[PDB]
């Protein structure tokens, strides 16, 4: 009651007996599996991150600080376009349990499905990511690591921002350079407007079907490139309407860049007439079960319907 509000998010501790790992997804080693809350007659698809046991105690506390910090953030947020933490489990190694995003990160998704992503998907993704960031801004959260790789894909129609390792309250105090606002690189300044810049880069990643920003350019130069007024080039499928919104996100005066709530409005306008704003050959002809090896999927509930 001296300024900020108490964070009353619930931190759920889960038992190992309650979830079954099914398959490895990555290596912090991440499994796909199912979580069956005791006595609830539901099966919830989950990602289970089992932390690396770590050799050096300095590496140990680095792993653990990322883990507890992003457990704290994901437990405190609740929005259809941000990833929710379902719980943690304090076995010998700590495990973080999140809602399963079956289709992986969005960068790999647009890379692998270039020839079947239509303009309606692209623009709807832009709207959903801006809704997620607008929610974070409503909660005074600055993400500092927004990128296509940090957007996950529940369905082709539904994505969610993730990876809150670098997040912080707006006013508070204490490295992907090609996604960083200029004032982030020069003065270590981070705001919701620097997130807006990163959002511009992410949209450019999407519109280019996963190209690398400033490909082959060494990070040491990016700062001088940007002070000289250079920016990422207009993607081939982008009308000037879309590209111009993106370019506005990269203006040097952070207060001149658009706001996330403006970006929601503008991309929603454009998603009302997708083919007037992105030009994709064969657009009109583009389309997109037991994910586990379990034969009894009848009681499966998505985390979003259990909550
Ligand atoms: N809930 C989830 N559902 C499905 N896949 C996931 C989920 N969470 C993470 N992954 C993937 O599993 C791997 C673990 O990623 P992560 O633990 O976030 O490490 P990271 O280095 O921070 N990756 P990033 O957030 O993209 O910067 C990545 O390939 C993710 O895309
Ligand atoms: Mg992280």
According to DSSP H, which parts of 254-302 are helical? 260-271
The Cα–Cα gap between 202 and 152 comes to 13
- Relative to the CA of 102, which ligand 1 atom is closest? 4
Look at residue 25 and tell me if it is in a domain. yes
Ligand nearest to the CA of 66: 2
Domain final residue, candidates 84, 100, 116: 100
Q: How far apart are the first and last CA of the chain?
A: 29
Return the best residue to mutate from 19, 23, 24, 25 for the ligand 1 pocket (most ligand atoms within 8 A of CB): 25
The Cα–Cα gap between 178 and 185 comes to 9
CATH number where 94 lies: 3.30.200.20
Angle at 11 between CA 9 and CA 15, to 5 degrees: 160
Ligand 1 site residues, Cβ closer than 6 angstroms:
25-26, 28, 30, 47, 49, 98-101, 104-105, 149-150, 152, 162-163
Q: Do 22 and 163 share a domain, yes or no?
A: no
- Catalytic annotation, residues: 145
The Cα–Cα gap between 42 and 38 comes to 9
Domain final residue, candidates 100, 119, 134: 100
CB 102 within 8 A of CB 93: no
Q: Could you tell me the distance, in angstroms and rounded to a whole number, from the CA of residue 19 to the centre of ligand 1? A: 19
Q: Do 61 and 144 share a domain, yes or no?
A: no
Q: Do 182 and 89 share a domain, yes or no?
A: no
CATH number where 141 lies: 1.10.510.10
The Cα–Cα gap between 160 and 207 comes to 18
Ligand nearest to the CA of 49: 1
Q: Could you tell me the distance, in angstroms and rounded to a whole number, from the CA of residue 96 to the centre of ligand 2? A: 12
In Å, how far from its chain's centre is CA 230? 26
- Angle between helical axes of 119-138 and 260-271 (0-180°, round to 10): 160
Look at residue 294 and tell me if it is in a domain. no
Q: Do 281 and 134 share a domain, yes or no?
A: yes
Residues facing residue 95 across a β-bridge: 50, 89
Buried b (16+ CB within 10 A) or exposed e, 243-263: bebbebbbbeebeebbbbeeb
CB 178 within 8 A of CB 219: yes
The Cα–Cα gap between 168 and 111 comes to 30
Considering only CA atoms, which of 81, 48, 80 is closest in space to residue 292?
48
Return the best residue to mutate from 19, 26, 48, 106 for the ligand 1 pocket (most ligand atoms within 8 A of CB): 26
Q: Do 40 and 162 share a domain, yes or no?
A: no
Q: Could you tell me the distance, in angstroms and rounded to a whole number, from the CA of residue 287 to the centre of ligand 2? A: 32
- Relative to the CA of 25, which ligand 1 atom is closest? 12
Look at residue 7 and tell me if it is in a domain. no
Look at residue 304 and tell me if it is in a domain. no
CB 37 within 8 A of CB 20: no
Resolution number, Å: 2.4
CB 178 within 8 A of CB 214: yes
Number of domains in the chain: 2
Q: Do 147 and 232 share a domain, yes or no?
A: yes
- Relative to the CA of 66, which ligand 1 atom is closest? 22
**Token pair for residue 37?**
């809350």
Q: Could you tell me the distance, in angstroms and rounded to a whole number, from the CA of residue 231 to the centre of ligand 2? A: 27
Q: Structural domain of residue 26, as residue ranges?
A: 16-100
Q: Do 146 and 261 share a domain, yes or no?
A: yes
Look at residue 159 and tell me if it is in a domain. yes
The Cα–Cα gap between 49 and 53 comes to 12
Q: Do 153 and 96 share a domain, yes or no?
A: no
Ligand nearest to the CA of 68: 2
Residues contributing to the annotated binding site for ATP: 25-30, 49, 98-99, 163
Radius of gyration over every alpha carbon of the chain, rounded to an integer in angstroms: 20
In three-state secondary structure terms, 131 is helix
Q: Do 79 and 179 share a domain, yes or no?
A: no
Domain final residue, candidates 100, 126, 141: 100
Q: Do 72 and 119 share a domain, yes or no?
A: no
Q: Do 129 and 239 share a domain, yes or no?
A: yes
Look at residue 169 and tell me if it is in a domain. yes
The Cα–Cα gap between 149 and 136 comes to 18
Considering only CA atoms, which of 74, 58, 101 is closest in space to residue 12?
74
CA distance readout (Å), 291 to 28, 29, 34, 46, 273 = 22, 19, 10, 11, 34
Look at residue 264 and tell me if it is in a domain. yes
- Relative to the CA of 165, which ligand 1 atom is closest? 22
What pairing do the DSSP bridges indicate for beta strands 85-90 and 168-169? unpaired
Look at residue 203 and tell me if it is in a domain. yes
> Which residue's CA is the closest to the ligand 1 atom numbered 20?
163
Q: Do 139 and 248 share a domain, yes or no?
A: yes
Q: Could you tell me the distance, in angstroms and rounded to a whole number, from the CA of residue 270 to the centre of ligand 1? A: 30
């Amino acid at each position: 009651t001296s300024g900020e509000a108490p964070n009353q998010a619930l931190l759920r501790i889960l038992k190992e007996t309650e979830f079954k790992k099914i398959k490895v997804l990555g290596s912090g080693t991440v499994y796909k599996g199912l979580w069956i809350p005791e006595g609830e007659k539901v099966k919830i698809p989950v990602a289970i991150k089992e932390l690396r046991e770590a050799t050096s105690p300095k590496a140990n506390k680095e792993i653990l600080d990322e883990a507890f910090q992003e457990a704290y953030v994901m437990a405190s947020v609740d929005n259809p376009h941000v990833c929710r933490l379902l719980g943690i489990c304090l076995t010998s190694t700590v495990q973080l349990i999140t809602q399963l995003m079956p289709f992986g990160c969005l960068l790999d998704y647009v890379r692998e499905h270039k020839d079947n992503i239509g303009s309606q998907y692209l623009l709807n993704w832009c709207v959903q990511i801006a809704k997620g960031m607008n929610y974070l801004e409503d909660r005074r959260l600055v993400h500092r690591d927004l990128a296509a790789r940090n957007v996950l894909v529940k369905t082709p129609q539904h994505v969610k921002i993730t990876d809150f390792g670098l997040a912080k309250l707006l006013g508070a105090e204490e490295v992907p350079i090609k996604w960083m606002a200029l004032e982030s690189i020069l003065h270590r300044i981070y705001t919701h407007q620097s997130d807006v810049w990163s959002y511009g880069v992410t949209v450019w990643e999407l519109m280019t079907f996963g190209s690398k920003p400033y490909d082959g350019i060494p990070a040491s130069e990016i700062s001088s490139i940007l002070e000289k007024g250079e920016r990422l080039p207009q993607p081939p499928i982008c009308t000037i309407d879309v590209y111009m919104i993106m370019v506005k996100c990269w203006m040097i005066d952070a207060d001149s860049r658009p706001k996330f709530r403006e970006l929601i409005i503008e991309f929603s306008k454009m998603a009302r007439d997708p083919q007037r704003y992105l030009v994709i050959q064969g657009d009109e002809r583009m389309h997109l079960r037991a994910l586990m090896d379990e034969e009894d999927m009848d009681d499966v509930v998505d985390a979003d319907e259990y909550l």
